[PDB]
Amino acid sequence: MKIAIFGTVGAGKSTISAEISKKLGYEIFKEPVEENPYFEQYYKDLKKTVFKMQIYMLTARSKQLKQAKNLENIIFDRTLLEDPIFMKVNYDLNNVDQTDYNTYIDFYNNVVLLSFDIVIYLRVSTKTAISRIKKRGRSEELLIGEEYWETLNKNYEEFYKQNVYDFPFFVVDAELDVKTQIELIMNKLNSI
Amino acid sequence: MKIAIFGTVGAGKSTISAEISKKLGYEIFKEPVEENPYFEQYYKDLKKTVFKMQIYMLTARSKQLKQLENIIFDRTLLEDPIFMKVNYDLNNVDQTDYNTYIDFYNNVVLLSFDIVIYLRVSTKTAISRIKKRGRSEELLIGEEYWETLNKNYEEFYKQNVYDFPFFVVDAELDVKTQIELIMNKLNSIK
Ligand SMILES: Nc1ccn([C@H]2C[C@H](O)[C@@H](COP(=O)(O)O)O2)c(=O)n1
Ligand SMILES: Nc1ccn([C@H]2C[C@H](O)[C@@H](COP(=O)(O)O)O2)c(=O)n1
Numbered sequence: 001m002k003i004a005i006f007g008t009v010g011a012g013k014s015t016i017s018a019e020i021s022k023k024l025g026y027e028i029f030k031e032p033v034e035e036n037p038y039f040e041q042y043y044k045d046l047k048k049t050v051f052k053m054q055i056y057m058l059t060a061r062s063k064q065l066k067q068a069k070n071l072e073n074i075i076f077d078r079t080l081l082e083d084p085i086f087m088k089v090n091y092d093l094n095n096v097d098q099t100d101y102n103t104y105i106d107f108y109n110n111v112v113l114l115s116f117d118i119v120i121y122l123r124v125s126t127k128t129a130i131s132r133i134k135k136r137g138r139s140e141e142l143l144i145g146e147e148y149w150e151t152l153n154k155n156y157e158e159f160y161k162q163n164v165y166d167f168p169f170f171v172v173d174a175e176l177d178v179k180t181q182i183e184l185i186m187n188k189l190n191s192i
Numbered sequence: 193m194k195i196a197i198f199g200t201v202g203a204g205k206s207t208i209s210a211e212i213s214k215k216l217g218y219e220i221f222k223e224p225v226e227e228n229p230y231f232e233q234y235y236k237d238l239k240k241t242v243f244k245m246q247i248y249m250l251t252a253r254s255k256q257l258k259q260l261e262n263i264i265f266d267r268t269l270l271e272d273p274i275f276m277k278v279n280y281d282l283n284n285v286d287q288t289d290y291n292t293y294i295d296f297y298n299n300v301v302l303l304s305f306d307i308v309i310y311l312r313v314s315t316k317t318a319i320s321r322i323k324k325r326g327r328s329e330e331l332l333i334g335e336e337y338w339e340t341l342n343k344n345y346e347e348f349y350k351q352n353v354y355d356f357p358f359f360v361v362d363a364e365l366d367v368k369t370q371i372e373l374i375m376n377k378l379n380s381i382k
């Protein structure tokens with residue numbers, strides 16, 4: 001049983017996956033923000049840091065997968081699907097030029113490129129996510145303007161909508177109480 | 193028969209490999225500098241460009257490998273990390289950014305050559321060969337860069353001498369004599 005957990009910053013992936021974990025007894029794949037050495041300067045100056053950051057992320061996510069395929073039962077807090085989403089956001093915002101974007105996408109498919117039983121999309125409005133970053137995120141995520149969070153969220157919907165038929169997506173209203181979200185996830189899991 | 197051609201900038205890899213090609217009838221794998229969109233600004237400002245550039249290179253080199261019995265490789269994926277290390281020793285890419293690449297290179301990126309032909313050459317010759325046969329971009333950066341690169345090529349050969357079927361060619365010699373030496377080594381494996 002392999003469970004991807006899917007959604008923007010402050011959707012509540014760590015919360016939801018930690019809860020699933022307690023209930024099922026599975027480990028969480030969690031690229032920990034506290035070990036990422038780019039994160040601290042990242043938001044202070046997006047133009048300079050993003051490319052390198054996005055590269056570090058593929059490296060980190062790909063290294064975990066050399067350990068994830070050993071195990072029958074996993075929970076993924078974010079997947080390798082979601083990483084290109086972050087690069088596209090910065091591109092639409094003119095924070096990484098065309099060339100640097102082409103390099104990544106080209107790269108992503110012909111260098112980097114994984115079969116989830118379910119992809120749980122924690123669907124959430126940007127307001128809630130923004131306040132959940134304030135409540136539960138980190139120091140650094142407070143630094144950048146909110147337009148960034150709006151485009152990211154818009155780009156998550158966009159991604160779900162392009163790929164809805166290609167992945168075993170299951171949408172959870174992430175506006176709901178955590179208890180009710182977990183209840184909904186457990187019943188879907190029990191039925192597969 | 194898979195032939196890697198190995199050495200620093202201006203050793204004469206394109207010349208040597210084009211010659212081998214004519215003699216054997218094999219295609220050349222040549223990451224063409226004219227298609228690399230980073231190259232033009234690359235040398236003008238190494239700190240800004242190198243990381244991205246070195247990433248583009250692994251991508252390009254890895255994409256070619258997704259393409260066959262008889263090949264000649266003008267530069268291999270072995271030599272790419274050499275360029276990143278050069279810029280690191282020169283403080284042109286910090287520790288973090290170097291760690292990211294090396295980490296990456298092994299656990300993301302990582303291919304069996306019958307021969308690795310090391311076109312061994314002094315930096316003076318290479319510098320004058322860039323001067324007459326490279327391009328305008330390679331003229332822009334100082335020479336210390338070429339000296340460390342060359343030093344780092346020897347270093348690499350010396351660490352890996354036993355792990356790859358290395359064959360050293362005195363690249364100071366005439367092209368005709370180099371080709372003569374390569375063909376005889378090739379004939380004695382073929
Ligand atoms: N490809 C990625 C993945 C993550 N992050 C950053 C965005 C978040 O601020 C932080 C942690 O992600 P999350 O809060 O969704 O768990 O990592 C990023 O910039 N690019
Ligand atoms: N990993 C690499 C590979 C190549 N180059 C640049 C250095 C050379 O100036 C140019 C062409 O290589 P050569 O003339 O040795 O064939 O490509 C680079 O900066 N980093």
Ligand SMILES: [Mg+2]
Pocket residue numbers: 013014077
């Ligand atoms: Mg999280």
Ligand SMILES: [Mg+2]
Pocket residue numbers: 205206266
């Ligand atoms: Mg060449």
